[PDB]
Design an enzyme around this catalytic site. Structure first.
Site, short mmCIF file in Angstrom:
data_model
loop_
_atom_site.label_atom_id
_atom_site.label_comp_id
_atom_site.label_asym_id
_atom_site.label_seq_id
_atom_site.Cartn_x
_atom_site.Cartn_y
_atom_site.Cartn_z
CG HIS A 61 -1.79 -1.23 1.32
ND1 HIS A 61 -2.81 -1.53 0.44
CD2 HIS A 61 -1.69 -2.29 2.17
CE1 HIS A 61 -3.34 -2.69 0.77
NE2 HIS A 61 -2.67 -3.18 1.81
CG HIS A 91 2.50 5.72 6.34
ND1 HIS A 91 2.17 5.60 7.67
CD2 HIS A 91 1.46 6.33 5.73
CE1 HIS A 91 0.95 6.09 7.85
NE2 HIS A 91 0.49 6.52 6.68
CG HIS A 93 -0.92 8.59 2.28
ND1 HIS A 93 -1.75 7.49 2.26
CD2 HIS A 93 -0.59 8.79 3.58
CE1 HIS A 93 -1.96 7.07 3.51
NE2 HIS A 93 -1.25 7.84 4.32
CD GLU A 103 -4.17 9.60 3.02
OE1 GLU A 103 -3.89 9.58 4.24
OE2 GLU A 103 -4.73 8.65 2.42
CG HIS A 116 0.04 10.40 7.34
ND1 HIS A 116 -0.95 9.76 6.63
CD2 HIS A 116 -0.19 11.72 7.19
CE1 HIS A 116 -1.75 10.66 6.08
NE2 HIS A 116 -1.31 11.85 6.42
CB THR A 195 -6.23 8.06 5.80
OG1 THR A 195 -4.90 7.58 5.58
CG2 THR A 195 -6.25 9.39 6.61
N1 LIG Z 1 -2.74 6.90 7.25
S1 LIG Z 1 -2.78 6.87 8.82
O1 LIG Z 1 -4.12 7.34 9.04
O2 LIG Z 1 -1.69 7.60 9.23
C1 LIG Z 1 -2.58 5.22 9.16
C2 LIG Z 1 -3.33 4.17 8.57
C3 LIG Z 1 -3.14 2.84 8.96
C4 LIG Z 1 -2.24 2.52 9.97
N2 LIG Z 1 -1.86 1.37 10.52
C5 LIG Z 1 -0.92 1.63 11.45
C6 LIG Z 1 -0.24 0.69 12.25
C7 LIG Z 1 0.86 1.01 12.96
S2 LIG Z 1 1.37 -0.40 13.77
C8 LIG Z 1 0.14 -1.40 13.16
N3 LIG Z 1 -0.61 -0.61 12.36
N4 LIG Z 1 -0.73 2.95 11.46
C9 LIG Z 1 -1.53 3.54 10.57
C10 LIG Z 1 -1.71 4.88 10.20
ZN LIG Z 2 -1.11 7.69 6.31
#
Ligand SMILES: NS(=O)(=O)c1ccc2[nH]c(-c3cscn3)nc2c1
Ligand SMILES: [Zn+2]
Ligand SMILES: [Hg+2]
Length: 256
Positions: A61, A91, A93, A103, A116, A195
């Site tokens: 992703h 990470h 986007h 986003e 993020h 998100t």
């Molecule tokens: N795009 S976001 O809203 O920053 C976002 C979306 C999905 C996420 N999943 C995790 C996570 C961190 S450790 C296990 N899962 N962290 C996440 C952060």
């Molecule tokens: Zn994110």
């Protein structure tokens, strides 16, 4: 399974994840003339000196830079937050073109990408318990525009070669996320959600006003990543952003 394409993208998510149509979904458009300065906000405190990165992962992703969150080392506090939130991963986007990718949007303006930095509320013991709570997460969002290179991003860019396809990871120790931050910590904040699926409504969003600049060459390398796994036909990892969702009478507060 879920993704960003025509047949499995944001428009389809609600079927497996009905919360996609919930009351505090992210991201949102930040209407700068509707957001109100909030004098009750404490200064924001980003303490990343002791951050310990471990590895980088292509999860089909995006890519995640993961941190050792077993001690209090890299923490976000202050601003709208009560208590201490611990850095777990970051990470991005991004888009297929420089005109899209973020986003969150600012007066409907889309940036080329968005960073993020994901933190969990240390009062809940770990990430898994935190995502069961309305105040379990804090995500610090930083817009990217295309211009001058960001020197502190190059280490990330150079390792992407090694994690081209879904499921690949690489050792990624001693990465300093202080090198990804703009000069100013002025921000907007609002209650929201993850998100991507499972789109859990557990996030206090803190979106910085000042974008960072990255080079065309840097973003171009993001766009060489693959959504598919090794030995599968190539599906470039681009446009892995969810569009703005209904604000539903939430209020976006400004720190400035
Ligand atoms: N795009 S976001 O809203 O920053 C976002 C979306 C999905 C996420 N999943 C995790 C996570 C961190 S450790 C296990 N899962 N962290 C996440 C952060
Ligand atoms: Zn994110
Ligand atoms: Hg929640």
């Amino acid at each position: 399974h879920w993704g960003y394409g025509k047949h499995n993208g944001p428009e389809h998510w609600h079927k497996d994840f009905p919360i996609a149509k919930g009351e505090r979904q992210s991201p949102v458009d930040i209407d700068t003339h509707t957001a109100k300065y909030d004098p009750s906000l404490k200064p924001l405190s980003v303490s990343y000196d002791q951050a310990t990165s471990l590895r980088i992962l292509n999860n089909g992703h995006a890519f995640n830079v993961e941190f050792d969150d077993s001690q209090d080392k890299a923490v976000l506090k202050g601003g709208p937050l009560d208590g201490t939130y611990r850095l777990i991963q970051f990470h991005f986007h991004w888009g297929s073109l420089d005109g899209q990718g973020s986003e969150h949007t600012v007066d409907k303006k889309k940036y080329a990408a968005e960073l993020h930095l994901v933190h969990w509320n240390t009062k809940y013991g770990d990430f898994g318990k935190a995502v069961q709570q309305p105040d379990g997460l804090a995500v610090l969002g930083i817009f990217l525009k295309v211009g001058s290179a960001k020197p502190g991003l190059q280490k990330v860019v150079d390792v992407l070669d090694s994690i081209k396809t879904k499921g690949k990871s690489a050792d990624f120790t001693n990465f300093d996320p202080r090198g990804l931050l703009p000069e100013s910590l002025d921000y907007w904040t609002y209650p929201g959600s993850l998100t991507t699926p499972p789109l859990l409504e557990c996030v206090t969003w803190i979106v910085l006003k000042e974008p960072i600049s990255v080079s065309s060459e840097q973003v171009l390398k993001f766009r060489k990543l693959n959504f598919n796994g090794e030995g599968e036909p190539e599906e470039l990892m681009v446009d892995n952003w969810r569009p703005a969702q209904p604000l539903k009478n939430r209020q976006i507060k400004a720190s400035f």
